Structure 1
Amino acid sequence: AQSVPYGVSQIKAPALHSQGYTGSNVKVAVIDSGIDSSHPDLKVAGGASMVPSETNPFQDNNSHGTHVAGTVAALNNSIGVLGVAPSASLYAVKVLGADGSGQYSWIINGIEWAIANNMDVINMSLGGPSGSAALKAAVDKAVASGVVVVAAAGNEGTSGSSSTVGYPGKYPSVIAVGAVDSSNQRASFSSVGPELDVMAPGVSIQSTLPGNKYGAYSGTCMASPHVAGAAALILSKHPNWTNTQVRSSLENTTTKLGDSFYYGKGLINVQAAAQ
């Protein structure tokens, strides 16, 4: 039997699914550790590896990219789990190695790849403490090209009165996503700052793992894909909307939680955002 992870329901995805809006024909790039294309609950359309030593993007030696991919797009069938946009065209852009780290060059190459291959949405469940002119130029070009760019805010928790949002989530062009639990409480590890945009479920999120497995992970890395998937649903309903429109709709229809420093605009609600 198929199980519907709490977080998919929490953001009100199933309402859209029942209406026939499932993300069909929207290309979502998962820029991460690759995706196990052999998982029965996923269908990978394409992608590319930017890691010099790991040339196959469809082999996930880490597990992280397969888990993020499941949240976006696990298939609607009689097994496994169910993604936010189960019909989305899923691309694996492998920029992290088996150890779950990668060089900035690799990540940026991956962003460039996604722009050149006309991805509609990019998900980056990754971040570092520092930016670069090249990282900023790449996300900016993506948005200027009409792509919706979403990223995890980071897992650095609080630090006095300072922002702890990582890059590239810190850039204005990117939607930075923090994590709540099933009670809508902010997860203690979720990064904070004025650059935080929205929240999505990020604690004990069940999804796909390599070798026909499922399991839970926690992090803003797990929250991000909910938003990327939500953007795909919106695009499936309103194919003519610009990235700006998609983003404003998500931000302006949230369930407001606490202060924006900790919660951004609040918890996304795809039902409301999809109008």
Structure 2
Amino acid sequence: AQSVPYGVSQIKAPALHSQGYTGSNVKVAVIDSGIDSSHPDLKVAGGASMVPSETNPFQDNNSHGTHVAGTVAALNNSIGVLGVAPSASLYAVKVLGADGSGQYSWIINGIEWAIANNMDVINMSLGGPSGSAALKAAVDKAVASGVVVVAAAGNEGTSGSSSTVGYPGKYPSVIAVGAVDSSNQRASFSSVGPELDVMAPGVSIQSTLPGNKYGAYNGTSMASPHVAGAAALILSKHPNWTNTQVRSSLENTTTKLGDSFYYGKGLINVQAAAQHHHHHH
């Protein structure tokens, strides 16, 4: 039997599934450590590797990209977990090696591949404390070209009044996603600042792991793919909505939580986002 992880229910994805919308025909690039294409609870549609010494994007030697991919798009069947957008076309864009790290140029090459291959949504469960002009230009180019770009806010927690959101989440063109638990409390590691946009579940998130396994991970890495999956659900119900409209739909319908420095606009609600008229609940 299949299980629905709590975070998929918490963002109200089952309301979209019951309407008949599951992310069909929406192309989502998971820009990450690869995706294990042999996992029976995932269907990988394509991809490419930007890691010079690891040329197969369908081999995930870290585990991280496979977990993130399952939150986006684990299949709707009688096994394992259910994803937020279980019919999405999932692309493995490998820019991190076995050790979970990548050079800025590898990340940029992945974003460029995503643009050239007409991805609808990019998820980046990755980041670092400094930007670069070249990175900003790549994310800005993707958004100018129509792509919804979602990234983890970072796991730096608080530092007084300072923002601790990392890049690329900290760029205005990118939706930066912080982590809450099942009670809607901010995770203590979740980055903070005026660049924090929305929150999603990021504590004890069950998803797919390589070699036909499942497990619970924590991080803003786990929160980001709930939002990327929600963007795929919204586009499946409204295929002509622009990235601008998908982003505003998510922002304008959150359930508001605390102060925006710590919670941004609050928890996403994909049911309210995918209606024509938007308001917060």
Q: How far apart are the structure 2 equivalents of 1:145 and 1:8?
A: 29
Q: Deviations over 1:142-161 (max 9, x none)?
A: 00000000000000000011
Q: How far apart are the structure 1 equivalents of 2:163 and 2:12?
A: 29
Q: Deviations over 1:202-246 (max 9, x none)?
A: 000000000000001000000000000000000000011110000
Question: CA shift at 1:19, angstroms?
Answer: 1.0
Question: CA shift at 1:75, angstroms?
Answer: 0.2
Q: Deviations over 1:91-138 (max 9, x none)?
A: 000000000001001000000000000000000000000000000000
Secondary structure, in 3 states, of the residue corresponding to 1:141? helix
Secondary structure, in 3 states, of the residue corresponding to 1:87? coil
Q: Deviations over 1:32-90 (max 9, x none)?
A: 00000000000000000000000000000000000000000000000000000000000
Q: Deviations over 1:159-180 (max 9, x none)?
A: 0110000000000000000000
Secondary structure, in 3 states, of the residue corresponding to 1:199? strand
User: Taking structure 1 as the reference length, what is the TM-score of the superposition?
Assistant: 1.00
Q: How far apart are the structure 2 equivalents of 1:173 and 1:34?
A: 24
Give the match for residue 191 of structure 2: 191
Gaps of 5+ in 1: none
Q: Which runs of 4 or more aligned residues in structure 1 lie more than 4 Å from their structure 2 counterparts after TM superposition?
A: none
User: Taking structure 2 as the reference length, what is the TM-score of the superposition?
Assistant: 0.98
Q: How far apart are the structure 1 equivalents of 2:206 and 2:245?
A: 30
Q: How far apart are the structure 1 equivalents of 2:215 and 2:221?
A: 15
Gaps of 5+ in 2: 276-281
Instruction: Count the aligned residue pairs.
Output: 275
- 2:246 counterpart of 1:242: no
Q: How far apart are the structure 2 equivalents of 1:246 and 1:2?
A: 29
Q: How far apart are the structure 2 equivalents of 1:25 and 1:135?
A: 28
Q: How far apart are the structure 2 equivalents of 1:14 and 1:118?
A: 27
Secondary structure, in 3 states, of the residue corresponding to 1:225? helix
Secondary structure, in 3 states, of the residue corresponding to 2:127? coil
Q: How far apart are the structure 1 equivalents of 2:51 and 2:231?
A: 27
Say what the alpha-carbon RMSD is for the aligned residues.
Answer: 0.3
Secondary structure, in 3 states, of the residue corresponding to 2:123? strand
